[PDB]
Design a protein around this ligand. Sequence first.
Ligand SMILES: O=P(O)(O)O[C@H]1[C@@H](OP(=O)(O)O)[C@@H](OP(=O)(O)O)[C@@H](OP(=O)(O)O)[C@@H](OP(=O)(O)O)[C@@H]1OP(=O)(O)O
Ligand SMILES: O=P(O)(O)O[C@H]1[C@H](OP(=O)(O)O)[C@@H](OP(=O)(O)O)[C@H](OP(=O)(O)O)[C@@H](OP(=O)(O)O)[C@H]1OP(=O)(O)O
Ligand SMILES: Nc1ncnc2c1ncn2[C@@H]1O[C@H](COP(=O)(O)OP(=O)(O)O)[C@@H](O)[C@H]1O
Ligand SMILES: Nc1ncnc2c1ncn2[C@@H]1O[C@H](COP(=O)(O)OP(=O)(O)O)[C@@H](O)[C@H]1O
Lengths: 885, 885
Amino acid sequence: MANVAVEFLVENLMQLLRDNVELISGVKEAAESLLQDLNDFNAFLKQAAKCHINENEVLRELVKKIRTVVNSAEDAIDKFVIEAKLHKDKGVTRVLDLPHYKRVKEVAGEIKAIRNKVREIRQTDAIGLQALQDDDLSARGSEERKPPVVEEDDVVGFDEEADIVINRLLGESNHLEVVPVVGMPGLGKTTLANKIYKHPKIGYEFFTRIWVYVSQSYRRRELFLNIISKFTRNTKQYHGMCEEDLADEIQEFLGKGGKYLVVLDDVWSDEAWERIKIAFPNNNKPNRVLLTTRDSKVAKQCNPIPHDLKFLTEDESWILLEKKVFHKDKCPPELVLSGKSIAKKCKGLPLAIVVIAGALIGKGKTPREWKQVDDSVSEHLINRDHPENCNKLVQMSYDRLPYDLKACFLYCSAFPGGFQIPAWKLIRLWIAEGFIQYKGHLSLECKGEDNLNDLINRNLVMVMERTSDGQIKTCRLHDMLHEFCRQEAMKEENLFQEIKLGSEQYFPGKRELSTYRRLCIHSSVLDFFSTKPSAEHVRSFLSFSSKKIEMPSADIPTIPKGFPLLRVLDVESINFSRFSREFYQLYHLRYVAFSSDSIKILPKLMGELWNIQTIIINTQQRTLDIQANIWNMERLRHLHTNSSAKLPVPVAPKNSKVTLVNQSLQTLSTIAPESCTEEVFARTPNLKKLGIRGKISVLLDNKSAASLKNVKRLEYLENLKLINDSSIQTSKLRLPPAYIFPTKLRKLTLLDTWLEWKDMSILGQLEHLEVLKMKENGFSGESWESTGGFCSLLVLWIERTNLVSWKASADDFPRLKHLVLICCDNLKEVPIALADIRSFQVMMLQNSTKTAAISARQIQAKKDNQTQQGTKNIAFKLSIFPPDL
Amino acid sequence: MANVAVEFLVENLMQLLRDNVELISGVKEAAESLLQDLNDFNAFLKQAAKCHINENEVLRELVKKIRTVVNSAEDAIDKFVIEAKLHKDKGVTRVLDLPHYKRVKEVAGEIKAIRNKVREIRQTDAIGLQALQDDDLSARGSEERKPPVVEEDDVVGFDEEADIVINRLLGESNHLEVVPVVGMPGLGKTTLANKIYKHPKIGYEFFTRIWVYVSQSYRRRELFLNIISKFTRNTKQYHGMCEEDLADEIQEFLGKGGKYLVVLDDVWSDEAWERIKIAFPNNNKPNRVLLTTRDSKVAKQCNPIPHDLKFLTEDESWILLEKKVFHKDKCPPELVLSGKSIAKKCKGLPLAIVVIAGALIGKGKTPREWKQVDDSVSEHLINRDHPENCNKLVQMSYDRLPYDLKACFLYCSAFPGGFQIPAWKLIRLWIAEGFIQYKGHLSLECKGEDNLNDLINRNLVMVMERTSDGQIKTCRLHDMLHEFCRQEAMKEENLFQEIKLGSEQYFPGKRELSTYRRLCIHSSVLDFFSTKPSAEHVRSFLSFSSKKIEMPSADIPTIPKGFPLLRVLDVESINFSRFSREFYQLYHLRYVAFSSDSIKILPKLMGELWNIQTIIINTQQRTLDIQANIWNMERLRHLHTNSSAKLPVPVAPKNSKVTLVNQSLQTLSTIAPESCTEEVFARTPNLKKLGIRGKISVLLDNKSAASLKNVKRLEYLENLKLINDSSIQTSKLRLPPAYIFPTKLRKLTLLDTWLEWKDMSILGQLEHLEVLKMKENGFSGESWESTGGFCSLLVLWIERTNLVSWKASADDFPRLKHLVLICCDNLKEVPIALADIRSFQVMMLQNSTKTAAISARQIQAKKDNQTQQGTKNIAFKLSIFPPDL
Ligand SMILES: O=P(O)(O)O[C@H]1[C@@H](OP(=O)(O)O)[C@@H](OP(=O)(O)O)[C@@H](OP(=O)(O)O)[C@@H](OP(=O)(O)O)[C@@H]1OP(=O)(O)O
Ligand SMILES: O=P(O)(O)O[C@H]1[C@H](OP(=O)(O)O)[C@@H](OP(=O)(O)O)[C@H](OP(=O)(O)O)[C@@H](OP(=O)(O)O)[C@H]1OP(=O)(O)O
Ligand SMILES: Nc1ncnc2c1ncn2[C@@H]1O[C@H](COP(=O)(O)OP(=O)(O)O)[C@@H](O)[C@H]1O
Ligand SMILES: Nc1ncnc2c1ncn2[C@@H]1O[C@H](COP(=O)(O)OP(=O)(O)O)[C@@H](O)[C@H]1O
């Protein structure tokens, strides 16, 4: 939508005028003029949006060229800004910088012609404003939306295929067999196969169970490395071994672990199965493979008997729609006939019905909306076999979205097919692109999380992984939605364009690449950069690859010089050895991610990019030294890192009264303990997440820095992590008293502190802490005895400890819901008093002593009797690692 | 040929037995038995080769099974070598090395199994050549092959096509019309183009003329870079800007010098034309493009009138056949009729005439041989349209090559089709690959050049360029010939395999790779190594990519670990930042050629190797410290580079009587001036080609360590090159006395020495000097007065010198043949006395004063008058790069 670009340009111009007067100084009148005209433009596009522009040709004619004239302005202003900052570097103290001030004033001549153009067009727009304001529709207020807790996890009317499949498997002893499943896209082969892979009988039967996704763009060796990973810890060794030997190693590991069930998803080409099957050892055991698909030929080839999936009958259809649109509550009677007619209109496709329930949630729950939706569906599914019917249905759902979500959905279609989207990165990309604008009081990140939850609710985006906290950790887009969104973006809106290279084709020429605004290259990238492209109007550049590619020493300069107007640059999948000066000459850079293996210092010139919001760095060295004045970069909001970062020593200005305290700074992913000082925390009042890697001892000792005591100043801090990199128990470490920590702290992580279990009382004293995660021998001992305090703790996580005896009472953990016990191969039993807590719902116990498993089964039987006893308890689910136990 | 493999194994086994008793100490008995078995079986293989091999299957089966055991013996022997060297590396002083000595005894058991297999072949038949001994064919002696002679520079029957093409240009000025040349394969379009391009009218008609070769796998950017690099000297910019901008610059430069005539060779598809045609924007000038295409559709798309290359007429065909087979001499009357039958059977395809001429010259000059050849040609040229006729003719020609020369002719397809092959690289490769073996007294490289001349004489190898010396410089195979050799090698013999992946195809599995003995890649080797392939039976690797490519630091150790028995490592188009230690266990390496841009030190572990013969490095480091002990490598024949290599100080051991005098060394291209001490020359009695690069004044001055005086000691030196990197003239340099130079010096090159023409007398005194090359103001001054001495000189190269006045008489250069003057914008006139030099053959003049051009025209007129007077003076040739001069 043109509104997005208009708003972003207005905001950036305002920020540049307020903040940096000197750069814009030669053209201030033109800046203010463009500001007024863009405000008026935005109002006009809103008024046009109120109407159905597609209904009138004149309205559609009017919108065109609103966007091009706006685009011409953005270009001229940005070129001017970069030119004048280069002038500042020139340091021409001449009063009249006649040489090359006439170049920045050539850009200003373009600016002036552009201001003249914008003054025009605005006069024509004033014509037809009154006529447009005569008409309006959908005059209503805005309501709230609510978080997407799990709902309808049960699968309507699909027990039949589940039981048939679970029956078929385990037929012939000592045979490696494959179970094909087919059925048109959106039917639910993955959903049913998930229900199988999570049915109790399957987990009872086979010990090893691997979930594997194999699309068309799948890679064989990438898959083998990960499957070997399922068994062992490190794959960096097998980065240097052949696929065949890798196939052999997977075979040995998989054969060792008794039986095995392996799931490969959405296969496309029979040769794909032919190649992948090698790793599986046919060692004369009843091991079952479960592949699903869409094409019939491959299913038939891999086994002469494919099990075809089934459509949902009319009743299943209506019940499913009722569930999705009305969630737990039951439908009010008046809409029943409408909903049943729509369900019948669907023909029993779970995908069409699901998206339609999303559209109904979007419209409302009033009879007029239901009748209109019924009429529209009765029109857009006249055929069955044509997939574009699903596209028409999704378009109908899509039309009702707010334009802000319209931008986010398309931009979520940017990622490659089959790629699992990291939610935090997706939110930060949305922020840096300008799709989320200040409205209200929520922090930008919270608004982004709410937007993602909204998109999940109407069933456009399917969630894949969730956190311990219950939040979302990784999402993606179903194939049909990906195709519809990609076509809509690359064709209509020109949001972005992709450059995947088919056989016997060439990367476009400079004239074509001239008309792009964003690039995505998810295929051979070094090949596009060996050509030395040049497109002055590329603002973003995305490359979400699978492997890590090295960048040749003679090829580093190409990105900075080819695209001198970047804003977003995510090349996390490309490893750099260094950087060139043109890099530090990129002055519009907002988002910047990159990897590296020999980087140790963040050069100081990097602090001259005065618009950076986000920074993400990967480095193999333990210590990363930062020399750029991050206290100078006003708008910095995040600084991620995987090594231990050594922040610079802060100094306030001497001749300037102004103090350097960043109000908008929310993260310091991993800083060294040496910098956990009073001043570092004086400068970050609003900090919400902090991490410290290094030798946690320096913190805990009270000589060098009362560092844990320094932590008291961060009032809003809500997440902390203590990572120790020393591998030597030089002394014993002691946590300070529980009045030093912040009050809202909600999630803590320890790793190799090696603390004594008596200190757990201090943590019990904390009030709001909701998740405790101690990994890799965080607390050392053999005797912990609960002493109360964990009033609100919701998830407990213990991994790689030598604890033996634990003792508690049902009043120690009143709100427990989740309990994680990993790699505790020296614990004996879990206290049974944990079976008394009502909310205790999920437990898991990995690589643990079998006596603990027997006690856990006792606890499960206890809670089963409780729920049987008429209490309104939440259902009980257990998990014990041993297949036998 | 299998005899080649048997002989290679025999020679290596004898070498290993002689040099190191320890390496074969455990299995010396079976090794010697295998050696004698190989000798007798090679006698058997020769006896088989005496009888027809192509026509008999049982005979091939007899000799077959011996090649397999020979390959297996090679594998096991190299395995034992690497294993014994690994034992040495372990440095176990135990009398009984309980770990790994049983593994080596099992490898000895494998060696004994191969010995048993060879003895089993001998048991099946004591010799197996009794039937072969009964029948003998082709008994005759081996006589001389003539030294190469440039001959038949005239083209027969294509002059009328040349006239028609030269009538095409001047068709319509102020326009761009493409000339299409269309013909069947081996027809001679490219010869007609190479003629017309060389026509005096063409050079006079256009000041600028370009020759461009459009292969099937052409890349546009590299072609444009070549066109640009033609005109200018500096290209640091054009490596940085894009191919659209590159074509724009090509337009600019071709328009700077007015009208131009460019040639595109062997256009295959239409897209080639559509994309290359944008680089010739007509500047409303009379511009012509010459396009040779085998296909016709592309020609019609280029221009609705393609120039149709006719077939040779019968008389033209015969004059060709007699010229080729007989060279200057005419056809003897008795062979006239057999020749006429052969030529009339050729159907006019000149390539058939040429290949049959090669077959005749190889066979001999007797009527029975001519009749046999004619009958075969009749038998195999029944049809007309099928190109496979040429494959059949080539097969006839090939069955007659000497088995050594057969192996030589083949494996030339290992170099990708269409690639100019440096002759020196081919010769050194043949030497390293055991292809050329010690037979007689000729030096290995001399025998290699002899073989290459022999092949070229047979007209199976084409020469692209020569030298003022007239020595072959670069050679390439014809398209059809390259295709034939490719199919031959990859199918019937298994000399090498070409891993060229389509879009669908994937790289081979390790299983397929197991049966390969030589690898040739010509597509992405980066991706090939990305799959991390492995192979033990691989001895040769070649990848002639067009560009230079980097090896990611994680991909560096792939080649060693995958290939532990590597001999020929042809990776010169690959870049190496560093080397894994696994490189330094490749005890089977014979040939190492590789690039780099940061390598400053060759590690001492490089010296550990012993089997290498050639070392080749092109680094951009101005210095290259060589810390390997080269003096301990006896078989080092060649250490080629372009850097100012600083050799290690030759130190004799304190407790050894062995003289570290390497009797195999032949060349030290660009050693450091500091490294020219009496010792290093004293270690190399047989040095043949030397050149220095660095601070040469350190060589000249007597106070300085007298390097140039010591250079006398090399009695076998024949090639000397002196190069100065010092751009600063801190003093004037003076040459030593004439006697100090080696007696047998024959070619000299001077760059950046800025000598004083008064010294030219000293160089005159040199008795044997035959090539002189002064460049980069080699001699600094304004007036030259030649004083004689250059009795045996033949060619004179003057480039970028500020000479003003030259005075010479005909008595100074009685035997000289070639004058050339590059960029002498200072030179006034050329001594007209040089016109009296009978031997004077060809003159060239580039970017000189027009006065020199007019005086050169005077000299040309004088020579034309001389020959017009009845003197048997050789034809003279004049050429001026700018015709305006
Ligand atoms: O062995 P050299 O005495 O050093 O001469 C050779 C050779 O010159 P000749 O034709 O006289 O044998 C090549 O031929 P030209 O170029 O001189 O015609 C030349 O090839 P390039 O200049 O193309 O490289 C080559 O150069 P290189 O050392 O790179 O192999 C090098 O002569 P120069 O090095 O002095 O140019
Ligand atoms: O499951 P989560 O709720 O995501 O909690 C953590 C945490 O994530 P958050 O701090 O954002 O909540 C870490 O995030 P990052 O370190 O990447 O910033 C991540 O990595 P760590 O191990 O270093 O804590 C870790 O993932 P994992 O432990 O698997 O590596 C993950 O916990 P999960 O195990 O559930 O992913
Ligand atoms: N039996 C069912 N009941 C309700 N919804 C379903 C059912 N089966 C699939 N779905 C819906 O379909 C989507 C899952 O996609 P799916 O059909 O499994 O992809 P594919 O079948 O193409 O692999 C989800 O939105 C899910 O809610
Ligand atoms: N005299 C000639 N007449 C016709 N074609 C020729 C002649 N000489 C070379 N050719 C062409 O050159 C190619 C092979 O040339 P070749 O026999 O090597 O001679 P040259 O060394 O002069 O090129 C073929 O395409 C052939 O048609």
